[PDB]
Amino acid sequence: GNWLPGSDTPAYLDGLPGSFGFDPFGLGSTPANLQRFQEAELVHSRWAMAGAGAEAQRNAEPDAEKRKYPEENKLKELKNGRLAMLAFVGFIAQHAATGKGPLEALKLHLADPWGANFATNGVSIP
Amino acid sequence: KAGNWLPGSKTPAYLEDLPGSYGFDPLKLGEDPASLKWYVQSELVHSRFAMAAVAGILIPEVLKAFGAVNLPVWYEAGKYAQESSPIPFNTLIALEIFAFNFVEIKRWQDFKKPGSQGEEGSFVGLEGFFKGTGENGYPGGVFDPLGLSKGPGYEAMKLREIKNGRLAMLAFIGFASQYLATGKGPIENLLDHLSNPLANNFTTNGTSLPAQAHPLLSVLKP
Amino acid sequence: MKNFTTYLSTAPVVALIWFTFTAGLLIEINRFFPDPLVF
Amino acid sequence: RASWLPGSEIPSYLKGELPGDFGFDPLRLGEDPAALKWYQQAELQNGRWAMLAAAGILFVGGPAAATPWFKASDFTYFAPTSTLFIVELLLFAWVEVRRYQDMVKPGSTNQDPIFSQYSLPSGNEPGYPGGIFDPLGYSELKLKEIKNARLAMLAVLGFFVQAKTTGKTPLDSLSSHLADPWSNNVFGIEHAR
Amino acid sequence: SGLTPCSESKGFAKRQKNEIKALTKRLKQYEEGSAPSLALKATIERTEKRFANYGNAGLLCGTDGLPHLISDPGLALRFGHAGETLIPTVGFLYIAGWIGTAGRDYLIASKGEAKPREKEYIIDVPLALKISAQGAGWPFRVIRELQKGTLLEKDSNITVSPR
Numbered sequence: 073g074n075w076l077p078g079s080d081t082p083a084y085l086d087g088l089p090g091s092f093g094f095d096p097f098g099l100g101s102t103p104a105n106l107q108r109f110q111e112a113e114l115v116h117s118r119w120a121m122a123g124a125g126a127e128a129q130r131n132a133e134p135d136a137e138k139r140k141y142p143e144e145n146k147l148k149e150l151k152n153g154r155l156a157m158l159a160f161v162g163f164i165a166q167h168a169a170t171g172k173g174p175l176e177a178l179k180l181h182l183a184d185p186w187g188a189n190f191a192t193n194g195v196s197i198p
Numbered sequence: 199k200a201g202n203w204l205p206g207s208k209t210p211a212y213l214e215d216l217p218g219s220y221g222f223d224p225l226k227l228g229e230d231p232a233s234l235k236w237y238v239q240s241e242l243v244h245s246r247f248a249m250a251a252v253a254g255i256l257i258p259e260v261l262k263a264f265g266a267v268n269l270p271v272w273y274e275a276g277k278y279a280q281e282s283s284p285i286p287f288n289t290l291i292a293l294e295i296f297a298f299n300f301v302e303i304k305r306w307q308d309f310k311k312p313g314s315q316g317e318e319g320s321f322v323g324l325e326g327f328f329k330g331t332g333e334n335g336y337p338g339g340v341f342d343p344l345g346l347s348k349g350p351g352y353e354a355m356k357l358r359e360i361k362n363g364r365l366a367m368l369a370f371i372g373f374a375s376q377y378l379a380t381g382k383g384p385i386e387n388l389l390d391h392l393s394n395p396l397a398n399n400f401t402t403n404g405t406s407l408p409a410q411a412h413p414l415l416s417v418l419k420p
Numbered sequence: 421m422k423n424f425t426t427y428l429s430t431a432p433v434v435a436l437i438w439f440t441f442t443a444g445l446l447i448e449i450n451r452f453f454p455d456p457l458v459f
Numbered sequence: 460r461a462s463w464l465p466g467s468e469i470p471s472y473l474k475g476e477l478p479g480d481f482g483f484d485p486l487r488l489g490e491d492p493a494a495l496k497w498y499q500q501a502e503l504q505n506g507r508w509a510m511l512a513a514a515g516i517l518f519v520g521g522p523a524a525a526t527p528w529f530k531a532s533d534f535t536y537f538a539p540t541s542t543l544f545i546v547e548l549l550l551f552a553w554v555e556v557r558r559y560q561d562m563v564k565p566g567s568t569n570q571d572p573i574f575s576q577y578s579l580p581s582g583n584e585p586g587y588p589g590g591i592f593d594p595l596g597y598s599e600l601k602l603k604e605i606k607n608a609r610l611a612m613l614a615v616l617g618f619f620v621q622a623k624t625t626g627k628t629p630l631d632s633l634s635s636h637l638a639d640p641w642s643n644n645v646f647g648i649e650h651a652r
Numbered sequence: 653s654g655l656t657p658c659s660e661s662k663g664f665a666k667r668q669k670n671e672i673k674a675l676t677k678r679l680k681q682y683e684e685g686s687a688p689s690l691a692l693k694a695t696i697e698r699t700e701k702r703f704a705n706y707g708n709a710g711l712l713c714g715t716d717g718l719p720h721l722i723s724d725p726g727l728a729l730r731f732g733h734a735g736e737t738l739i740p741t742v743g744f745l746y747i748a749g750w751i752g753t754a755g756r757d758y759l760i761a762s763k764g765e766a767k768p769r770e771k772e773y774i775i776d777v778p779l780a781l782k783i784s785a786q787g788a789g790w791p792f793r794v795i796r797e798l799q800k801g802t803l804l805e806k807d808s809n810i811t812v813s814p815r
């Protein structure tokens with residue numbers, strides 16, 4: 073649907089897979105940038121889910137869809153991948169902010185949801 | 199026009215439609231249109247710098263007066279931050295020179311050719327950030343993330359920005375002059391004025407009216 | 421009065437007034453701030 | 460037409476369209492229609508939060524309910540003071556972006572995001588929603604709301620100023636004024652510094 | 653340059669002492685409270701203040717015991733001598749550009765009159781005072797004329813002798 077229900081989504085975003093109409097700053101307003109950033113989102117999401125010669129052959133073909141997908145499962149991949157990149161950035165930020173691993177901090181949140189979070193530790197809020 | 203800076207005077211015609219205009223140009227600096235465009239940008243840039251600076255001075259000082267925080271005073275905050283700064287002084291200057299050279303050249307290029315930093319191939323794929331609005335001094339894009347320039351209060355917000363900007367510019371120069379004249383911070387200066395306004399002002403700081411130029415000060419006293 | 425003010429606007433009268441003002445200003449600066457060598 | 464000052468001139472942009480319209484704008488604050496609409500919504504918002512605040516301040520046994528309202532933050536809860544601030548910020552962020560998006564484009568936020576069959580009825584005003592916000596069909600009533608909202612705003616301001624100068628609870632201030640009114644009021648108390 | 657600060661120069665101190673001694677020798681021929689005595693004492697006070705002020709300004713002194721000025725902008729800024737020549741350079745150039753711009757503005761304004769030569773020896777004093785006040789903003793206007801191309805007359809419009 074819509075990232076902001078009531079906001080008017082741009083016309084270039086409609087029809088794309090995984091399009092919730094989110095482009096406030098209009099970076100995909102041109103087709104050349106929109107096609108390349110579609111590849112970048114898919115590659116970032118695929119690397120986040122799992123976390124020279126291979127990357128060179130990725131862009132050797134002159135096609136458009138083969139650089140991205142070499143309709144329901146595409147949206148399924150895009151909604152799962154974005155959560156994976158959010159999760160990895162959360163892992164980096166939490167290990168930078170508490171000094172602990174990503175799994176033991178889940179147990180610390182479970183054992184104290186109201187006294188141990190990003191608000192309490194003196195890194196995320198000075 | 200927002201008004202007349204001097205009621206009854208003849209206001210210049212080239213300032214009739216500018217936001218924040220009171221017809222104030224007695225030195226005729228903005229009579230040339232290209233100069234006027236450059237000075238509009240310069241006034242906005244000075245306004246926004248002073249705005250942020252006066253915020254970063256006054257809000258810590260207000261919260262220090264309220265007992266909330268105890269951050270260092272503004273004229274000594276450079277020393278205290280530099281000792282604890284992981285980055286040394288020279289590297290900080292070099293980084294600031296590089297970053298501001300880049301961003302000010304981008305702003306300058308947009309001033310000379312409007313919308314030219316948002317064209318296709320201008321930036322490295324991220325040119326949609328910097329499309330501009332076709333208005334001198336109002337970039338938008340990343341700089342207007344909430345999109346409030348597209349609302350109906352945009353023209354009144356331009357006027358609010360300029361008048362608050364001029365007030366902040368005067369306020370920062372007042373901060374600097376008050377420190378040079380009294381040696382104390384701005385909230386202490388305000389409290390001293392509030393305790394005795396007749397005796398605690400610039401006429402008694404020993405600097406603003408030099409004693410040699412004003413011999414009546416040493417004479418007309420109890 | 422118009423003819424008299426036109427005479428007062430002739431070049432030597434204006435020169436006299438302006439140079440009296442400038443010389444007086446310099447003299448009074450040096451009276452109030454004696455012996456200025458440096459800024 | 461009822462007015463705050465009978466016999467005076469009324470501003471031309473206040474014709475009783477709005478509830479509580481008594482022609483009271485001495486400083487001519489809301490003149491352009493965007494300003495007047497924003498100040499209408501802001502009056503509704505400030506008045507409703509002030510009604511809740513006046514109720515929650517006048518209502519306060521129990522060790523917690525014996526503390527002053529201006530010293531209420533020092534009571535011990537199950538969470539540190541930082542945690543509740545951010546949780547309240549998050550919940551308020553969600554409901555406020557919903558209300559703001561309604562304010563910009565009316566009727567835009569009327570549908571439950573997870574239930575497509577549950578939707579607020581159309582014709583919704585910005586400051587006057589419907590549906591689950593009016594479980595009873597109670598809807599003359601807008602004049603009552605705006606009057607109680609303004610009285611609560613003045614009452615909450617009185618709470619703030621009375622706790623700042625005298626340093627007393629509202630009930631203590633009322634009891635001090637009810638002891639001797641001619642000496643315990645704003646005159647004399649402030650004149651004794 | 654191998655100089656010494658005047659506040660630690662022995663020649664500077666000797667000069668102050670000698671000048672005060674000469675003025676004091678002149679003093680012991682007048683009664684106290686007389687006009688010559690008061691005038692000489694005022695001169696002595698001014699001499700003492702002058703030597704103190706020149707020592708306190710960080711001026712450098714030569715082997716002559718006299719202050720020597722530093723005028724290289726690099727040496728002045730790094731060693732605290734900008735008040736000797738550099739800041740006076742800025743002040744002079746500002747006033748001189750003011751005077752020149754006011755004169756140019758008055759001449760240009762007089763060029764459009766029906767009798768342009770009349771304003772050159774019978775001064776339009778209100779116009780001259782107005783133009784003189786506007787000379788404070790001369791660098792901005794002059795720089796704009798330079799970039800616009802209106803500061804200079806074109807070479808094809810200026811008379812020249814046969815070559």
Ligand code: CHL
Nearest residue numbers: 272273274275276277278279280281287288290291294302
């Ligand atoms: C607006 C900029 C600015 C101003 C007004 C000041 C003012 C001050 N600082 Mg700070 N600083 C400033 C920026 C910066 N300072 C510092 C780092 C420090 C330290 C570490 C210390 C100070 C201290 C001081 C005080 C000492 C007085 C002095 O040395 O004069 C400096 C006078 C100035 C006017 C600042 C420098 C000139 C100019 C404003 C710089 C910016 C101009 C642009 C770069 C020009 C660019 C040209 C364009 C067109 C290409 C003084 C109140 C110290 C002090 O209080 O001692 C106890 C102290 O210890 N400052 C950095 C990090 C590199 C800055 C970055 O911009």
Ligand code: CLA
Nearest residue numbers: 368369371372375376379387388390391398399400403406
């Ligand atoms: C932003 C505007 C502003 C405000 C509100 C103040 C306020 C104050 N100043 Mg600062 N100041 C300012 C700008 C300001 N100043 C500027 C631009 C300078 C450089 C000229 C100074 C230089 C200065 C010195 C050297 C001293 C003060 C002092 C004071 C105190 C008042 C007594 C006095 O001597 O007045 C200052 C007199 C002036 C002629 C400066 C006036 C400049 C402003 C811009 C005039 C416009 C005012 C505006 C029309 C109305 C203001 C309303 C307000 C709500 C903004 C008071 C705390 C004294 C002190 O620190 O405490 C005892 C003192 O010794 N000021």
Ligand code: CLA
Nearest residue numbers: 213218219220221222223227228237238240241244364367
């Ligand atoms: C660097 C700051 C700066 C700049 C670039 C401008 C530029 C502009 N001003 Mg603004 N202004 C400022 C600061 C500035 N102003 C401050 C602090 C105030 C409040 C006092 C104002 C109050 C003001 C009014 C009321 C109006 C303008 C107007 C204008 C515009 C046309 C006049 C012109 O061409 O001036 C060009 C200016 C410069 C090239 C800068 C000259 C700098 C010199 C060196 C100043 C030195 C003298 C000064 C007295 C020293 C300050 C001391 C003081 C702090 C105590 C132009 C956009 C008019 C306009 O129409 O609205 C948009 C108008 O009506 N200004």
Ligand code: CLA
Nearest residue numbers: 751752753754755756757758759775776779780781783784
């Ligand atoms: C409007 C006044 C004005 C202006 C802008 C100039 C500008 C110039 N002069 Mg010309 N000059 C003037 C008046 C002026 N002069 C007068 C009245 C005389 C007769 C004494 C001269 C005699 C003259 C000579 C002999 C030379 C110049 C040269 C120059 C050039 C280099 C600067 C210089 O050498 O200054 C030096 C200026 C003088 C020695 C005389 C200045 C006299 C005063 C200070 C200026 C006049 C002020 C005016 C009366 C103000 C009235 C305005 C008021 C009514 C509003 C420059 C083009 C030189 C050259 O051509 O360079 C390439 C050169 O060799 N000038």
Ligand SMILES: CC1=C[C@H](O)CC(C)(C)[C@H]1/C=C/C(C)=C/C=C/C(C)=C/C=C/C=C(C)/C=C/C=C(C)/C=C/C1=C(C)C[C@H](O)CC1(C)C
Nearest residue numbers: 094095096097098099116119120122123156157158160161
């Ligand atoms: C779209 C747009 C729109 C508008 O226009 C604007 C804006 C808003 C700006 C935008 C938005 C956005 C977003 C937010 C971005 C961000 C993102 C992501 C997060 C990235 C990633 C990121 C993520 C990804 C890369 C990833 C990576 C991962 C990796 C592999 C990992 C690795 C690891 C693992 C294996 C394990 C081992 O043992 C180790 C290691 C090795 C360590």
